[PDB]
């Protein structure tokens with residue numbers, strides 16, 4: 001099947017809230033909550049991809065971020081490797097730059113069932129921080 005490398009950014013403010021967007025109804029993992037991110041392209045690194053994806057999707061440039069978790073997940077029709085970057089400093093103010101819903105969500109209130117199932121261990125690990 002299809003095999004993808006995906007970089008996403010966990011955007012955390014100083015109030016323990018995360019900037020979360022919601023995927024379109026016609027997308028893979030439709031209507032799910034998500035960390036902004038996307039496919040790592042040929043000729044770019046995982047670090048470059050999370051910067052580019054956050055610039056495109058929510059209008060911020062991550063800086064001094066760290067790899068929170070890397071994991072693989074087998075969906076029904078595709079295999080992806082997810083790079084979860086913890087982003088605690090950035091230039092700009094995140095918004096729905098691609099017209100998608102986005103809002104700040106308390107970390108304690110996140111419900112893993114609202115996200116793709118691949119995110120389950122990451123959401124749990126974030127809550128222990």
Ligand SMILES: Nc1nc2c([nH]c(=O)n2[C@H]2C[C@H](O)[C@@H](COP(=O)(O)OP(=O)(O)OP(=O)(O)O)O2)c(=O)[nH]1
Pocket residue numbers: 006008027028029033034035036037038039073080082116117118119
């Ligand atoms: N963005 C994001 N994707 C996730 C998460 N968890 C998860 O399993 N995924 C999966 C859903 C998709 O199969 C894939 C992300 O690809 P995408 O749909 O964001 O692709 P993209 O933004 O590059 O799309 P495009 O603008 O290039 O057309 O990873 C997450 O927290 N954030």
Ligand SMILES: [Mn+2]
Pocket residue numbers: 038039
């Ligand atoms: Mn993309």
Ligand SMILES: [Mn+2]
Pocket residue numbers: 036037038039057
């Ligand atoms: Mn995306």
Ligand SMILES: [Mn+2]
Pocket residue numbers: 037038053056057
């Ligand atoms: Mn994108």
